[PDB]
Design an enzyme around this catalytic site. Structure first.
Site, mmCIF file in Angstrom:
data_model
loop_
_atom_site.group_PDB
_atom_site.id
_atom_site.type_symbol
_atom_site.label_atom_id
_atom_site.label_comp_id
_atom_site.label_asym_id
_atom_site.label_seq_id
_atom_site.Cartn_x
_atom_site.Cartn_y
_atom_site.Cartn_z
ATOM 1 N N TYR B 26 1.475 17.743 -21.154
ATOM 2 C CA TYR B 26 1.155 16.350 -21.119
ATOM 3 C C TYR B 26 1.312 15.658 -22.272
ATOM 4 C CZ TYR B 26 -2.909 16.875 -24.474
ATOM 5 O OH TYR B 26 -3.495 17.077 -25.659
ATOM 6 N N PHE B 36 0.036 9.185 -28.836
ATOM 7 C CA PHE B 36 -1.072 9.809 -29.929
ATOM 8 C C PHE B 36 -1.050 11.307 -29.600
ATOM 9 C CE2 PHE B 36 -4.145 10.386 -26.383
ATOM 10 C CZ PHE B 36 -3.861 9.471 -25.671
ATOM 11 N N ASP B 37 -0.707 11.863 -28.415
ATOM 12 C CA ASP B 37 -0.824 13.270 -28.200
ATOM 13 C C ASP B 37 0.252 13.819 -27.523
ATOM 14 O OD1 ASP B 37 -2.220 15.679 -28.864
ATOM 15 O OD2 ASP B 37 -3.825 15.389 -27.440
ATOM 16 N N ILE B 56 -11.295 15.342 -20.430
ATOM 17 C CA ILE B 56 -11.598 13.859 -20.159
ATOM 18 C C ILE B 56 -11.473 13.636 -18.454
ATOM 19 C CG2 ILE B 56 -11.315 12.677 -22.363
ATOM 20 C CD1 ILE B 56 -8.630 11.805 -21.023
ATOM 21 N N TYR B 82 -13.122 8.168 -22.781
ATOM 22 C CA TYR B 82 -13.222 7.803 -24.010
ATOM 23 C C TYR B 82 -14.229 6.723 -24.044
ATOM 24 C CZ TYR B 82 -10.714 11.419 -26.606
ATOM 25 O OH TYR B 82 -10.483 12.552 -27.192
ATOM 26 N N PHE B 99 -0.685 9.046 -19.276
ATOM 27 C CA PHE B 99 -0.737 10.532 -19.357
ATOM 28 C C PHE B 99 0.544 10.756 -18.485
ATOM 29 C CE2 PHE B 99 -4.845 10.408 -20.877
ATOM 30 C CZ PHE B 99 -4.855 11.187 -22.075
#
Lengths: 331, 107, 385, 255, 444
Positions: B26, B36-37, B56, B82, B99
Site C-alpha cells: 500500500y 506519509f506511508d 484502520i 483516524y 491509499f
C-alpha cells in the site's frame, strides 16, 4: 566465581613488568624532524604534548580537581621512569647520579615541574589519588636535590603570583591523619568478638601514611641542598599578597603526631606485651615522625636564621619534650 | 464511507473472508498529495487479518471489497480513518487519506 | 515623557546611553580565539567576575526596565513623535544594543541564566515584535543552553509561540537551533518538549522543506510540427497511435510513469515550451502538454478521472489512439478502439503541436505513425489524416 | 536537492532541519522516530548515503539522522553494557580457547565463538495503517544487511580514491567524505552486525599487512584529518575491547 | 618491520601520529594516549575486567537476560529528565528486578552490575531537583528506598556497599519521615537497614554520623511539625512523629544482635545529654511534668478527638496521643538499650557505672512503676454480638509498656524481693488477669 576472584588477586595483580623507561624514551624521541619540515620553531615531542595537555587541564578553572585516569596512569609511569631501579664504588655512584639527572631532564625539560605545581594548586587542599600521584611525580623529578628543578619551580611560583599552591599545601597538611586510638580500640574489639577481618591491613588507624610521607618528602626535597631562597619563600612568601607559614604548619603537624604517639603508648603502658598490630602502628607512626623531623632538619640546615627563629618561637619544644618522655619509657 | 476505484483489475472471483490474512503493498498519501506511508518503500508486504480491528476501518473495508490481484485506490474519510484527533506527528486532524493498495495474496 | 512632560524639559541622554552601551558591550565582549590558553583563561575568569558583580548589583533588572520603557512605544516613528527626532532615530539602535548587552551579561554564566528563569516568561511574550525578535532569540538561546532550570519553566504556550515565530517571520535557522536546544540540554532529553515540538511542527508540512525520491521522466517525439494559422496550407486534423509492448507497474518504490498525448511549443520556436528540461515532469504537467494515462486526463499538472470501458492504467498490449483537430480545438483519445469519455478543447493554438510520450523506466512502447513509419490497427476517424 | 550546492540559505536551513530531526528523536524517543520515518523515508536515506554529489553538510546530517532513528538506541545499550562480562556455563563456552591452534598466533579480532551475554536485538515495523500502539516501543526497522553491504562497498571505494588524493572528495572535503562513513561503520560494528568475512574484509581495509589471512595503504596510513583520526582511535578501542572480552571468556573456559 | 599484532600496530601508529603532527584537539590527544596506555598495560584490562566477570548456570540464562534488559531500561532512563511517564517506567522496571529470582540467588552479580549506585543516583536526582520546593515525585523516592532496603537485606556485603552512602542518606533523612504509610521507605530506613544487625558496620559507624541524628532530634524536639499544622493538626511544641523515626535509627545503631554496642551507646547518651531538649518537654526538666504525667496526658489527648485529629487512616488521622506515647516509648527503649551490660558492672567499669547512674537520674523508678501500673481497655462484645474493637493506633498499646519493662530490667534491675512483688502486684498481675479474661475464643 571464587576462583576467578582469587586468580585475579593472587596472579593478575601480582604480575609485574618494567616498560616505563622504554615508553618514556620512545615518547620523548623527536621523530623524523627533518622529514616534517615545519620551517619554524622546534616541533613538540609526544611527551611534551602529553605534559602540555595535562598542564592545560590543571590550569583550566574548575571548582574541584576532577579525577583523571589518564593522569593517574601517566604520572605514575613518569615517576617510575625517573627512578628505574654491596657498597657501590665512587664510579658507580657518580654514574647513577648522572643517569638519574638525565632521566629527570627527560621530564623537566618538557615542563613537568610547572604541571606538578599546577595540579597541587588546583587541588585546593583536598587529599586524593591525583594529589598522591602528583606528589610522587614531584619526588621523582626532585630526588637527589635537583637544583635545576628547584629553580624552575621557584621561578614559576614567583612569576605566577600564586597563593593557591601554599593554601593547598596548608590544607593537605591539616588534612593529614594521625593515630586514632578510638579506631584502634574498635578494630581490636572486633577481633576480640571474633569477627572476620575486613581489611588485612586495618589501615583505619593512620588512614594515609604513604601520602603524608610523600608530602613531607616533597616539602624536604624542595629545600634539599640548602636552597636558602626557597626556604625563605616557604617561610614567608614575599611577592604573594597572602602568605602561609609552612614552617609553622610542619611543627604543628609534628606536635599532633607526638600527641597521638604519646596516647598510643599510654594505652600500651599497662600491657606487658605489645601486640603485632600495635607494633605495625608504631612502625608507621615512627616513619611519619622521622620524615617530619627530616623535613624540619632540611628547613633548618644552612644558617637560615628566619626559620631558626620561627621554630624557636614555635611549639617545637613541646614536641621534643614529649618525644623525650616517650623515648625514655619506650626504650 | 470508502470509495474503491480499480486502478488494475484482479481475478474477480476470490474475496477476503473471516480469519484470512491479507498481504498487501500500500501507498498512503494525504489529500493534498503528500506521501506519509509506503510499504513498498519498506519493501515488506503488509499482513493483516479482517475483523480484528488492527488496521484502520477504511483500509479494512477497502480490502474487504477488494479482490485477489486487484489494484485499486482507497479514499478514506476522516471519520473512518483516524477521526479528529489524528495521528500525532504524521496525520493532521480531520484529514482525508488516499491509499493505493494491491491485494498480493491471501493466507 | 510617559507622564507627558514638556519635551524641552525632558532630559533624555540619548547619545550617552548609546556610547555607554557600546562601552559596556566592549567590556563584556567574550575573549577571542587566537590567544594562548592561559591568557584566554584569565580573560574568561575576568568576564565571569564582571558578570557576577553586575548581577549581584542587580544590573539585569535595570536593563529589563530600560527595555520595557522603550517597548511601551510601538514604532520608531511613534517614539520619534512622543520624543524628539533624534530619540526616534536612535530608538532601534538603543533597543538592539540593550538586548545585546543582556545577552552578553547572561552568556556563559550558569547562575545568571538561573535567576533569569523567572523573567524568561516575560521575555518570550514580546517575541513576535519585529524590532526585538533577533535579540530575544539570542537571549533565549543563551538561557536555554546554560540553565537546565529555564527548560522546566518553558511550556507548550511558549513552544507554540516559538513555532508561530517561524511560521510568521519565515524560514530562520536560529529558531530551529532554539528548538533543538529545547529538546536536549547537557545530555538530558526532555520527552515532553520533544513530543510537543514534533506534534506541533512536523504534521503541518508547511514550514520545513519536504523531500521525496522522484523517478526521472523523459519524453519521445517525432519530427512533425503541426500548426494552424490563417491562410496557411496545413491540414487541421491529425491522427496517430501508440501501443505498449511491455511495461512494469513497479520498477521501483514509486509507480511507473507512462503518459501519451500531444504537446505544444510557445511561438514558432521548435523547442518545447512550459516544461523543465529534466525532472519528474511529463506530458500534462503544464499548460503546453495534454496527456492520457489510461485513467485520467492530464493538463496543467492536474488530473481528472475519465470513464472508459474496463478502466485500467496503461499496461501491456494496450493501444492508444490520439486525435487532434486544430479547426475547432479538441483533443480526443480512444483506448483499444473504445472512446474515452472526455476531451481537451478550447486550448491555445498559437504555436506548433507534435505527438509526445512521457515515461520513467521499464517501458516498451512503439509509435504507430501510419504509412511507412507504421500502420493503424484501428482505422483513423473520418477526416483525420 | 543537488542544486543546494549553489543555494546557501536553503542548504543551511535544511541542515539545521536535519539537526532538529535528530534532536527530537535523540536519546531513544522511539515514538518520535516512528513519526520521523514518515517524513524522512528509508529510500531517501539509502539514496542520500550513496549519492556522490551529496552536499557535505546535508550528507553528514543524513548519516546522523539515519544513525539516530534506526541504530542509536541499540548501539547505546550494547555499548554501555560493554564492560560487564556475564558468561554462561555452556559447552560452547567450554570449547573456547585462548589461541586457535598450536601456533601462538593471535586470531583476527572479532572472529570466534563469543558466549558472553549481550542485550537482545529487537525492532518494530514502522507502519501507520495499524491501530496497534504497542509497536512504539523498540526503534524502527531497517535492513542491516543492505546497510552492511553498502557501507563495506562505499568504504572500499573511499580507501582507494582517497589515496590518490583527488580534488573532488564526496561532500567537498576529506572530513565530509570520511567522518560520516566511519561513524556509521563504527555504529554497525558496536551493534555487532558485522560477522566473519565482513570483519575480515573491513579489517583488511583498515590495515592489510597486520590483518593478513594465512602499495596498498590503509586508512591508518592514508594521512587522515584529526576527526577521522579520532574515529580511527574509537575503532581501535573497540577492537581492543573485543580482544579483552575474548581473553575473559577463555579464562572462564579454563576455570 | 611488520607489527604482526594489534598491540604493536596501535603502539606504532599512536606515536607516529603524535610525532607527525601537533594535535590541536585535546580529545584526540587524550584518546591517543589512553589507547597507547591500554596497549602497554595489557594486564590492566584483565585487572579491571575480572571484578566485573560473573558466571551463571545455563538454567538461569533466560532470567539473567530478563534482569539485564530491566537494568538496561533503568540505566537508560537516567539520561532522560524526571517525569510522570519516567516515574511509571522505573517503577515497573524496579518491580521486575525484585520479581526476578537471580536478584536473590546472585547478590554478587547484582552488586557487580552496579545497580545500587544506579538507584542511588536516581534518588539523588529526584531529591536534588527542587530541594527548596519540598519533594517532587514522592513515589520515585519511596520505590528507590524500598529497593535499597531489600538490597541491604539480601546480603551482608550489600549492607557494606550501602554503608558508604550513610552520610548523604542521613543528610536527606528528613524527606518522608512525617508522612506515614511511608514507613520502611525513607532514606533513614535505608540507613537503618544498612546498619541493621551488623556489628562490623555498627562499630565502623562514626561519631559525626550520630551527631547529625542528634541535631535532627534536638530540632524536632524544639520545634513543631510544619506539614501537620498546615494540614490542620493542633500545634504542640514538639514533633513526636519525626522524633520517633530518628530514635529508631539511634536504637539500631546502639543495639545490635541482643548485645549493646558500648562505644556507640556512650556517644549517643553523651550527645542526648549535652542537648537535653531531645528528651521531650516532659523529661526536659525545666519544669516538665514527668514521664508518667505525660503518659496520662497523652491518654487524655487520645480520648479527646479535638487534640488528637486535625479537626478542620492512621496517616490521614495521625493520633497525636499515640504519637507522643510512641515517642516516649522509643526514647525509653533507646536509653534501656544504651544501658551497659551486667558483666561490665560486675567488673566495676567506671564509665559503665557512670552511664547507669546517669540513666537512673534521667528516669526515676517511680515513673517506670506508674507507667507499668497503667492498664488497658479491652474489647467487649457489643449487644448485637459483635466485639467492639478499640483501635490501638489511637490508644495505649502493650508495645509501649514493653520499652518500660526493658528499661526497668536493664537499668534499674530487679534485685530486691520486696521490689519484685511490689512491681508485680501493682502492674503485672492485673495485666495477666486481663489476658486471662481475654481467653474466650471469640474474644481471643
Amino acid at each position: 566465581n571464587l576462583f576467578l576472584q582469587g586468580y585475579e588477586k593472587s596472579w593478575i595483580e601480582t604480575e609485574e613488568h618494567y616498560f616505563e623507561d622504554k615508553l618514556i624514551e620512545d615518547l620523548a624521541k623527536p621523530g623524523a624532524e627533518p622529514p616534517e619540515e615545519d620551517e619554524g620553531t622546534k616541533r613538540v615531542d609526544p611527551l611534551h604534548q602529553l605534559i602540555l595537555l595535562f598542564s592545560r587541564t590543571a590550569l583550566t578553572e574548575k571548582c574541584k580537581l576532577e579525577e583523571d585516569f589518564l593522569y593517574m596512569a601517566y604520572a605514575d609511569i613518569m615517576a617510575k621512569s625517573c627512578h628505574d631501579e654491596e657498597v657501590k664504588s665512587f664510579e658507580e655512584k657518580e654514574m647513577e647520579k648522572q643517569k638519574l639527572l638525565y632521566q629527570q631532564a627527560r621530564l623537566h625539560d618538557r615542563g613537568a615541574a610547572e604541571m606538578v605545581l599546577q595540579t597541587i594548586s588546583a587541588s585546593k587542599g583536598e587529599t586524593g589519588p591525583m594529589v598522591a600521584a602528583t606528589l610522587k611525580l614531584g619526588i621523582a623529578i626532585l630526588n637527589g636535590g635537583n637544583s635545576t628543578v628547584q629553580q624552575k619551580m621557584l621561578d614559576y611560583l614567583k612569576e605566577k603570583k600564586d597563593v593557591g599552591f601554599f593554601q593547598s599545601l596548608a590544607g593537605l597538611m591539616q588534612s593529614c591523619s594521625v593515630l586514632d586510638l578510638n579506631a584502634f580500640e574498635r578494630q581490636n574489639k572486633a577481633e576480640g568478638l571474633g569477627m572476620v577481618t575486613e581489611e588485612g591491613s586495618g589501615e583505619k588507624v593512620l588512614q594515609d601514611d604513604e601520602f603524608t610521607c610523600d608530602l613531607f618528602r616533597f616539602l624536604q626535597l624542595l629545600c634539599e641542598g640548602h636552597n636558602s631562597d626557597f626556604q625563605n619563600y616557604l617561610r614567608t612568601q614575599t611577592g604573594n599578597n597572602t602568605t602561609v607559614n609552612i614552617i609553622i604548619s610542619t611543627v604543628d603537624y609534628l606536635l599532633r603526631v607526638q600527641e597521638s604517639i604519646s596516647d598510643f603508648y599510654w594505652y600500651y603502658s599497662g600491657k606487658d606485651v605489645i601486640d603485632e598490630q600495635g607494633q605495625r602502628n608504631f612502625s608507621k607512626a615512627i616513619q611519619v615522625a622521622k620524615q617530619v623531623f627530616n623535613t624540619l632538619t632540611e628547613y633548618i640546615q644552612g644558617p637560615c636564621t628566619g626559620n631558626q627563629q620561627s621554630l624557636a618561637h614555635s611549639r617545637l619544644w613541646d614536641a621534643v619534650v614529649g618525644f623525650l618522655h616517650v623515648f625514655a619509657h619506650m626504650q | 464511507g470508502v470509495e474503491i476505484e480499480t486502478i488494475s483489475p484482479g481475478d474477480g472471483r476470490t474475496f477476503p473472508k473471516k480469519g484470512q490474512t491479507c498481504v498487501v503493498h500500500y501507498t498512503g498519501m494525504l489529500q493534498n498529495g503528500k506521501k506519509f506511508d509506503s510499504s513498498r518503500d519498506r519493501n515488506k508486504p503488509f499482513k493483516f487479518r479482517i475483523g480484528k480491528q488492527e488496521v484502520i476501518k477504511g483500509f479494512e473495508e477497502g480490502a474487504a471489497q477488494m479482490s485477489l490481484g486487484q489494484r485499486a485506490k482507497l479514499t478514506c474519510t476522516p471519520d473512518v480513518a483516524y477521526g479528529a484527533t489524528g495521528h500525532p506527528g504524521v496525520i493532521p486532524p480531520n484529514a482525508t487519506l488516499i491509499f493505493d493498495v494491491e491485494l498480493l495474496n491471501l493466507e | 515623557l510617559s507622564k507627558k512632560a514638556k519635551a524641552s524639559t525632558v532630559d533624555l541622554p540619548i547619545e550617552s546611553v548609546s556610547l555607554s552601551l557600546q562601552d559596556l558591550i566592549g567590556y563584556f565582549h567574550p575573549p577571542d580565539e587566537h590567544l594562548e590558553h592561559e591568557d584566554k583563561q584569565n580573560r574568561l575568569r575576568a568576564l565571569k567576575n564582571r558578570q557576577n558583580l553586575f548581577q549581584e548589583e542587580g544590573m539585569i533588572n535595570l536593563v529589563l526596565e530600560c527595555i520595557d520603557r522603550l517597548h511601551v512605544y510601538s514604532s520608531a516613528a511613534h517614539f520619534a513623535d512622543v520624543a524628539g527626532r533624534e530619540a526616534g532615530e536612535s530608538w532601534k539602535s538603543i533597543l538592539n544594543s540593550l538586548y545585546e548587552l543582556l545577552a552578553a551579561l547572561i552568556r556563559g554564566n550558569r547562575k545568571n541564566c538561573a535567576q533569569f528563569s523567572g523573567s524568561l516568561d516575560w521575555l518570550i511574550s514580546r517575541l513576535e515584535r519585529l524590532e526585538a525578535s533577533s535579540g530575544i532569540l539570542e537571549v533565549l538561546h543563551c538561557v536555554l543552553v546554560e540553565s537546565p532550570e529555564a527548560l522546566n519553566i518553558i511550556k507548550e504556550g511558549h513552544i507554540k509561540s516559538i513555532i508561530s515565530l517561524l511560521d510568521k517571520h519565515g524560514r530562520n535557522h536560529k529558531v530551529l537551533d532554539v528548538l533543538c536546544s529545547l529538546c536536549v540540554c547537557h545530555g538530558v532529553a526532555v520527552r515532553s518538549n520533544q513530543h510537543l515540538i514534533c506534534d506541533n511542527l512536523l504534521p503541518g508540512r508547511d514550514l520545513l522543506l519536504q523531500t521525496r525520491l522522484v523517478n526521472h521522466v523523459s519524453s519521445m517525439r517525432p519530427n512533425i510540427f503541426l500548426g494552424v494559422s490563417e491562410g496557411s496550407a496545413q491540414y487541421k486534423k491529425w491522427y496517430y497511435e501508440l501501443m505498449v509492448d511491455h511495461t512494469e507497474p513497479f520498477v521501483t518504490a514509486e509507480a511507473t510513469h507512462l503518459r501519451v498525448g500531444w504537446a505544444s511549443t510557445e511561438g514558432y520556436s521548435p523547442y518545447p515550451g512550459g516544461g523543465e528540461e529534466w525532472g519528474g515532469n511529463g506530458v500534462g504537467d503544464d499548460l503546453f502538454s495534454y496527456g492520457f494515462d489510461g485513467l485520467h486526463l492530464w493538463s496543467g499538472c492536474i488530473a481528472r478521472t475519465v470513464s472508459s470501458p474496463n478502466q485500467h492504467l496503461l499496461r501491456t498490449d494496450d493501444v492508444i489512439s490520439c486525435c487532434l483537430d486544430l479547426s475547432a480545438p479538441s483533443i480526443s483519445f480512444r483506448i483499444n478502439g473504445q472512446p474515452v469519455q472526455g476531451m481537451f478543447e478550447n486550448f491555445n493554438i498559437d504555436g506548433l503541436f507534435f505527438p509526445v510520450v512521457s515515461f520513467s523506466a521499464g517501458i516498451k512502447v512503439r509509435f504507430l505513425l501510419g504509412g511507412r513509419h507504421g500502420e493503424f490497427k484501428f482505422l483513423p476517424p473520418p477526416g483525420y489524416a | 536537492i543537488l542544486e543546494l550546492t549553489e543555494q546557501e540559505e536553503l542548504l543551511k536551513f535544511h541542515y539545521h532541519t536535519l539537526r532538529l530531526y535528530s534532536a527530537v528523536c535523540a536519546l531513544g524517543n522511539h515514538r518520535v522516530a516512528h513519526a520521523l520515518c514518515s517524513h524522512v523515508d528509508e529510500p531517501q536515506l539509502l539514496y542520500a548515503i550513496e549519492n556522490k554529489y551529496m552536499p557535505g553538510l546535508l550528507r553528514a546530517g543524513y548519516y546522523d539522522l539515519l544513525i539516530d532513528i534506526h541504530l542509536s538506541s541499540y548501539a547505546t545499550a550494547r555499548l554501555m553494557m560493554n564492560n560487564e562480562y556475564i558468561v554462561p556455563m555452556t559447552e560452547e563456552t567450554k570449547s573456547i580457547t585462548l589461541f586457535p591452534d598450536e601456533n601462538k598466533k593471535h586470531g583476527l579480532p572479532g572472529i570466534g565463538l563469543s558466549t558472553s551475554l549481550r542485550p537482545r536485538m529487537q525492532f518494530s515495523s514502522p507502519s501507520f495503517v495499524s491501530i496497534s500502539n504497542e509497536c512504539y516501543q523498540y526503534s524502527p526497522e531497517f535492513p542491516l544487511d543492505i546497510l552492511k553491504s553498502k557501507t563495506i562497498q562505499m568504504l572500499t571505494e573511499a580507501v582507494k580514491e582517497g589515496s590518490l588524493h583527488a580534488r573532488d572528495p564526496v561532500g567537498g572535503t576529506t572530513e565530509f567524505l570520511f567522518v560520516p562513513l566511519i561513524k556509521l561503520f563504527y555504529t554497525l560494528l558496536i551493534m555487532g552486525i558485522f560477522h566473519n568475512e565482513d570483519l575480515k574484509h573491513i579489517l583488511q581495509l583498515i590495515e592489510p599487512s597486520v590483518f593478513k589471512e594465512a602499495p596498498k595503504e590503509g586508512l591508518l596510513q592514508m594521512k587522515l584529518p584529526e576527526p577521522v583520526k579520532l574515529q580511527m582511535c574509537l575503532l581501535l578501542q573497540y577492537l581492543c575491547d573485543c580482544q579483552v572480552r575474548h581473553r575473559i571468556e577463555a579464562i572462564v573456559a579454563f576455570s | 618491520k611488520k607489527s604482526s599484532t594489534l598491540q604493536q600496530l596501535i603502539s606504532e601508529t599512536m606515536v607516529r601520529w603524535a610525532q607527525e603532527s601537533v594535535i590541536e584537539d585535546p580529545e584526540l590527544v587524550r584518546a591517543m594516549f589512553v589507547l597507547l596506555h591500554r596497549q602497554y598495560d595489557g594486564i590492566g584490562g584483565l585487572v579491571r575486567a575480572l571484578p566485573k566477570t560473573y558466571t551463571i548456570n545455563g538454567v538461569s540464562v533466560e532470567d539473567t537476560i530478563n534482569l539485564l534488559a530491566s537494568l538496561g531500561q533503568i540505566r537508560s532512563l537516567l539520561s532522560v529528565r524526571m517525569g510522570k511517564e519516567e516515574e511509571k517506567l522505573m517503577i515497573r522496571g524496579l518491580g521486575d528486578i525484585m520479581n526476578n529470582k537471580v536478584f536473590y540467588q546472585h547478590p554478587n552479580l547484582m552488586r557487580a552490575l552496579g545497580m545500587h549506585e544506579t538507584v542511588m543516583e536516581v534518588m539523588v536526582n529526584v531529591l536534588g531537583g527542587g530541594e527548596s520546593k519540598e519533594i517532587t515525585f514522592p513515589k520515585m523516592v519511596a520505590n528507590c528506598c524500598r529497593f535499597l532496603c531489600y538490597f541491604c537485606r539480601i546480603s551482608r556485603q550489600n549492607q557494606k556497599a550501602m554503608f558508604d552512602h550513610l552520610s548523604y542518606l542521613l543528610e536527606n533523612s528528613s524527606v518522608g519521615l512525617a508522612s506515614p504509610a511511608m514507613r520502611g521507605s525513607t532514606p533513614l530506613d535505608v540507613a537503618a537497614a544498612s546498619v541493621m544487625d551488623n556489628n562490623e558496620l555498627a562499630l565502623a559507624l562514626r561519631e559525626p554520623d550520630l551527631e547529625k541524628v542528634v541535631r535532627y532530634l534536638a530540632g524536632c524536639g524544639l520545634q513543631s511539625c510544619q506539614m501537620l499544622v498546615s494540614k490542620g493538626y493542633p500545634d504542640i511544641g514538639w514533633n513526636p512523629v519525626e522524633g520517633e523515626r530518628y530514635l529508631d535509627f539511634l536504637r539500631f545503631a546502639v543495639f545490635c544482635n541482643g548485645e549493646s554496642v558500648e562505644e556507640n551507646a556512650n556517644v549517643v547518651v553523651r550527645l542526648l545529654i549535652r542537648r537535653p531538649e531531645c528528651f521531650g518537654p516532659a523529661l526536659r526538666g525545666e519544669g516538665g511534668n514527668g514521664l508518667l504525667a505525660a503518659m496520662e496526658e497523652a491518654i487524655k489527648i487520645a480520648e479527646d478527638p479535638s487534640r488528637d485529629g486535625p479537626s478542620p487512616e492512621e496517616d490521614d488521622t495521625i493520633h497525636m496521643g499515640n504519637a507522643i506515647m510512641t515517642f516516649y516509648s522509643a526514647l525509653i527503649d533507646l536509653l534501656g538499650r544504651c544501658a551497659p551490660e551486667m558483666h561490665l558492672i560486675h567488673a566495676g567499669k567506671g564509665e559503665a557505672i557512670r552511664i547507669r547512674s546517669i540513666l537512673r537520674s534521667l528516669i526515676p523508678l517511680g515513673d517506670l512503676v506508674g507507667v507499668i501500673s497503667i492498664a488497658f481497655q479491652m474489647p467487649t462484645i457489643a449487644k448485637d454480638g459483635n466485639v467492639v474493637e478499640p483501635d490501638m493506633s489511637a490508644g495505649f498499646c502493650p508495645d509501649h509498656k514493653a520499652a518500660m519493662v526493658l528499661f526497668l530490667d536493664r537499668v534499674y534491675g530487679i534485685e530486691v524481693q520486696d521490689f519484685l512483688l511490689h512491681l508485680l502486684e501493682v502492674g503485672f498481675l492485673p495485666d495477666l488477669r486481663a489476658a486471662a479474661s481475654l481467653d474466650t475464643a471469640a474474644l481471643s
